[PDB]
Amino acid sequence: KCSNFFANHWKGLVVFLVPLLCLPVMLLNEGAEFRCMYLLLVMAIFWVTEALPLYVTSMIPIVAFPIMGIMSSDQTCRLYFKDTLVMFMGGIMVALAVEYCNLHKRLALRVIQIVGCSPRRLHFGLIMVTMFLSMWISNAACTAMMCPIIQAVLEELQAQGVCKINHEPEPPYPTKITLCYYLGIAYASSLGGCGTIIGTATNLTFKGIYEARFKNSTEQMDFPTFMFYSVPSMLVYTLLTFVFLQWHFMGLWRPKSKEAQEVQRGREGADVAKKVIDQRYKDLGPMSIHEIQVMILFIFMVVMYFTRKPGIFLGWADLLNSKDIRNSMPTIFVVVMCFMLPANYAFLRYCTRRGGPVPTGPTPSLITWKFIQTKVPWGLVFLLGGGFALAEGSKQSGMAKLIGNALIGLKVLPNSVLLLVVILVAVFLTAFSSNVAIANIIIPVLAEMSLAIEIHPLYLILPAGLACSMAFHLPVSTPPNALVAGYANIRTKDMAIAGIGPTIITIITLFVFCQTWGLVVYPNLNSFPEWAQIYAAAA
Amino acid sequence: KCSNFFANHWKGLVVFLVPLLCLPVMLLNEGAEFRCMYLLLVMAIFWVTEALPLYVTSMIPIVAFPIMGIMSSDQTCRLYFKDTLVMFMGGIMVALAVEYCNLHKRLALRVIQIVGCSPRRLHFGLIMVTMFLSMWISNAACTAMMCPIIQAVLEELQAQGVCKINHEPEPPYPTKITLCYYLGIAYASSLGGCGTIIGTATNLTFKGIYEARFKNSTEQMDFPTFMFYSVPSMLVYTLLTFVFLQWHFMGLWRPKSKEAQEVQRGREGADVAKKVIDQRYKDLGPMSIHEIQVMILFIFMVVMYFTRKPGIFLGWADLLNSKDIRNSMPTIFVVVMCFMLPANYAFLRYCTRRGGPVPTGPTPSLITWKFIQTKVPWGLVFLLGGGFALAEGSKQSGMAKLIGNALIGLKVLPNSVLLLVVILVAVFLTAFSSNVAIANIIIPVLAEMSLAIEIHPLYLILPAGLACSMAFHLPVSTPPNALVAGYANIRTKDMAIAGIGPTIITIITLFVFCQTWGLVVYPNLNSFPEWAQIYAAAA
Ligand SMILES: CCCCCCCCCCCCCCCCCCCC(=O)O[C@H](COC(=O)CCCCCCCCCCCCCC)COP(=O)(O)OCCN
Ligand SMILES: CCCCCCCCCCCCCCCCCCCC(=O)O[C@H](COC(=O)CCCCCCCCCCCCCC)COP(=O)(O)OCCN
């Protein structure tokens, strides 16, 4: 009776009680920094617990700041919808354009065909394609995009009878092979998300917070530099994750294991079956002009990103130095070009070369607004903006200096220990909640702590920002885990056991690579730069 | 052959040719204001013609301005998503919450029950309810909300056989009664849109442009003052539109007319029939706590709008004088409170008075995020932002001074003829295209022309801003017209012949009321205020 009441209505209890319980923080102390602290506590608890939808919770600052003596209404709204957010939303639109007309399927099928027929080889190909696609597209999208192929091939293999998808006789228990495939897809999506700024929202969040906090910083997380910093480690731990997954389920190094016998059986007689099903499933047809135009536009957008400000040559931006151009212009330009261009080029028959029937109606464009309006996750605007506004208000109120003075005690420990504990704390926190919320909560605190001690802010911000995305244990940790658990009825215990490998691999790889190669990309990480001294002295 | 080629593919021809044709404007003159003028011409032609979707076209300034010397990328994105736009979007969300749980149906049915039984009385009540609903909600939404009731009552009457929906024998021709009802609903929605700032987008557009251009203006279009200025005229010409429709289709003043004889039959019988069917739709069950909570929240929001800064008493926004609240808090506050509050209060059986069964799951909130995400027209953000950015860029580049000096020749004519010609031009232009585009095009030009001559800007801005919404002649003019034409297969010729009336009525009413009662609400229209003199002298 009374026990299940907490089980059903705990969210309402949190919503009702937390604002009342946190009130003495405001009443006891007089400064406005304490009001900002009260707001921070309430919003952090709402994000972690998820009592309210994240998008709704992100709207609180609009109400809260003008009531208090923090910010005016117009400035708070200006903090939302920065140019960087426009770049991200345009990137989502271009990804939608790619998804439309089915370019992704052609790329995935071709790479799998290039990779070998053996079942171990098929797993390797699937992970690599997912990592490359998640590098530019949202993670949950990529998981949904990739699952049907493996589902179809597994069903065909079961039809031949070489392997069984489920245990023979409460949903049926999945076998080891399907667990391996699905978990590999989800993990590959999560790992590949970290490669690029537009790969996932968390990268955008901490990049934006760092840029807003320190305008005078001489080290920049622009698009090429971040990609240079991130790609090699991503490749290394993706490969190591693949090796660990093969060891855990396929019996890679144990020849006498019974699991290895199943792999050997799959090697002989199932290669032809999956090859036939893959060839038939690649029946899209000859490559149309639609896909060619979309691909050319995408490549042009990437090239525009890379050419904005290289050290080799001036490039654009330097030539157009009248005003400050940003990477927002290349994206929106691609979106507009996608809307203007046609899709068939069949109307040329009118002017000359009257071969074939003329079109009977208006030629469709590359994309339609109805598709965009129904698929874009518009709440990300409020979520990212709320993070930015909270950071800015915390800076202006002066509560950031209060935390900075509070945490000064950590100066005793050496830098490496700080790096390790920061990574561990970030992983532990992101295990239980959304990545973006954890990033918003922890990044400004790290910035202020790094200012209080004499440590370069990037040296702590980058590893933590990357580590916030590493979530593998529980279904609640990340949406791809929930989708994969739903598709194949994966029990939580098995996923929790399997998640041990990627966590250790990512932690070790991040530690070593940030210690070694970050100095190669950023020479001044070890020392304390001049502008950091100026900022700390002003603080 | 070649004749139909223009019919099929004219939009692509416009998109390809117009930028090439307007290019000599940029090449011949070296000023940056000429580049801004080229941009203005291109966007104006794209909006009027609708070669591209409006939302896509509004995205051009983000790409265009930083390339030229007009503005930086950061500021251009800041221009989008202002405070006022956030207020409007929150208002749309609250309207969606009202649509949820079906409060509007109860209100409309109750008012129709209050009004009498004769078809004239039913028509009058239906128009009044449509006007009141459109005062707070989008026009097309209200039309879709209201049509099914009249459809049902007409079908029931046809089943009884008192009147025929369509002419007896290509879609069937609707009879005069059906035309009257549907056209009345559409016209009522269009007319009631003008009552309030959040009623329609055009009001928001010109209010925002005026506020951005003149910060120092003493006269203000705040929420209560605008409503005071607008409501009485709205009532007068809504009533006059009702009388014209009754004379045109139901022979109100002519007893001998056959149409009057059909009305007499409708009064003699079947009034009890429509009353019975109306009661059947009224049986929605007793009013629930859900609706009561939503209604209380809505009333509280409106009261919060009025008490922001009244002349009678200080109110809020003066007690909290640390920052300018700027009327954004109430709307987002209501949106958040909609998610926070429950919907049943059936969980209290746990504590005491067990009574009925306890709930078996979490209690739903007043609204769900899925409903909001799928129904909000998100492209309005880009449309309004593009309008604001174009206005600001025109101000900064210096094109405004050029146009104002160009149009100085109109000083010869007296004030009244300027008012009349402005109203006529606004109506003629809005007849053929979207209202928001016309407002965006014409408002800044009016502001600059008003500065060039010694005329108070409001004197011309308000009548034109209201006149942009008056569109009845063609289905292209406004979405409600298209919906009504689709529902009842209305022919365009009949629609124009019917709409000839409300145009004249609205023009005369606006002229007289703006000349007479605007002085009562704003005392200083006739004179040229000091701040206007300062602005003109500086510019
Ligand atoms: C200078 C000083 C300034 C101080 C400023 C302070 C500002 C504070 C602002 C926030 C104040 C609290 C707001 C609470 C809103 C209502 C929350 C109700 C949640 C609820 O339904 O809880 C149920 C259990 O309630 C319980 O167990 C508790 C009993 C709840 C009874 C109803 C309470 C709300 C009644 C109206 C209060 C007044 C509102 C207007 C101010 C379970 O809900 P669930 O989990 O099943 O579903 C939840 C999703 N729907
Ligand atoms: C020095 C500074 C200068 C600054 C100012 C200039 C800046 C750049 C301006 C660029 C403007 C856009 C250029 C590309 C527009 C392409 C539009 C094509 C539209 C189209 O398909 O038109 C069809 C007929 O075209 C026709 O009959 C038109 C002629 C033939 C068009 C096809 C061949 C060209 C294809 C595009 C080449 C682009 C090259 C440059 C990137 C009918 O289409 P529809 O109406 O049935 O369907 C339309 C679905 N949206």
Amino acid symbol at A432? F
DSSP string covering B463-521:
HHHHHTT---S-TTT-HHHHHHHHHHT--HHHHHHHHHHHHHHHHHHHHHHHHHHHHHH
Answer yes or no: do A336 and B60 touch at CB < 8 A.
yes
SS3 A13: helix
Query: CB-based contacts of B370: which residues, under 8 Å, 6+ apart?
Result: none
CA distance B92 to A99: 30
Q: How many residues are present in chain B?
A: 539
CB < 8 Å to A53, chain B: 339, 369
CA distance B336 to chain A (A): 6
Residue A33: in which H helix or E strand, if any?
Answer: helix A32-49
SS3 A397: helix
DSSP 8-state symbol, A166: B
Query: CB-based contacts of A29: which residues, under 8 Å, 6+ apart?
Result: none
Cα A324 to ligand 2 centre (Å): 29
Chain centroid to CA B322? 34
CB < 8 Å to A339, chain B: 52-53, 56
User: Cβ distance A139 to A190 under 8 Å?
Assistant: yes
DSSP string covering A92-153:
HHHHHHHHTTTHHHHHHHHHHHHS-SSHHHHHHHHHHHHHHHHTTS-HHHHHHHHHHHHHHH
Locate the domains of chain B by residue range: 83-101+288-366
CA distance A189 to A194: 9
CA distance A532 to A527: 10
DSSP 8-state symbol, A197: G
Among A8, A81, A326, beta carbon nearest to B359: A8
B521's tokens: 């609400």
Rg for chain B (alpha carbons), in Å?
Answer: 26
Q: Quick one: angle between helices A176-192 and A223-250, nearest 10?
A: 170
- List b or e across A31-48, with b for residues whose CB sees 16 or more CB atoms inside 10 angstroms: ebbbbbbbbbebbbbbbe
**Three-state secondary structure of A137-161:** CCHHHHHHHHHHHHHHHHHHHHHHC
Answer yes or no: do B77 and A347 touch at CB < 8 A.
no
Long-range pairs for A173-176 at CB < 8 Å and ≥24 separation?
A173/A489, A173/A491, A174/A488, A174/A489, A174/A490, A176/A249, A176/A250, A176/A259, A176/A262
User: Cβ distance B182 to B484 under 8 Å?
Assistant: yes
CB < 8 Å to B53, chain A: 339, 369
DSSP 8-state symbol, B166: B
CA distance B300 to B425: 40
User: Cβ distance A127 to A188 under 8 Å?
Assistant: yes
CA distance B7 to B2: 9
Cβ-Cβ pairs closer than 8 A, A with B, add up to 169
- Hey, which of B294, B319, B335, B347 would you mutate to test ligand 1's pocket, going by the most ligand atoms within 8 Å of its Cβ? B347
Rounded to 5, what percent of chain A is helix, strand, coil? 70, 0, 30
Answer yes or no: do B369 and A363 touch at CB < 8 A.
no
A161's tokens: 């009878």
Taking CA atoms, what residue in B is nearest to A93? B56
Phi, psi of A65 (to 5 degrees): -60, -50
Is any ligand 1 atom within 6 A of the Cβ of residue A13?
yes
Please name the residue whose Cα sits nearest to atom 21 of ligand 2: A342
- Resolution of the structure, angstroms: 2.8
Interface test with A, best of B86, B337, B338, B344 (most A CBs within 10 A): B86
- Region of A477 (left: φ > 0; alpha: ψ -120 to 50; beta: rest) is alpha
In terms of C-beta density within 10 A (0-12 exposed, 13-18 middle, 19 or more buried), how is residue B374 classed? exposed
Neighbours of A446 (CB within 10 A): 24
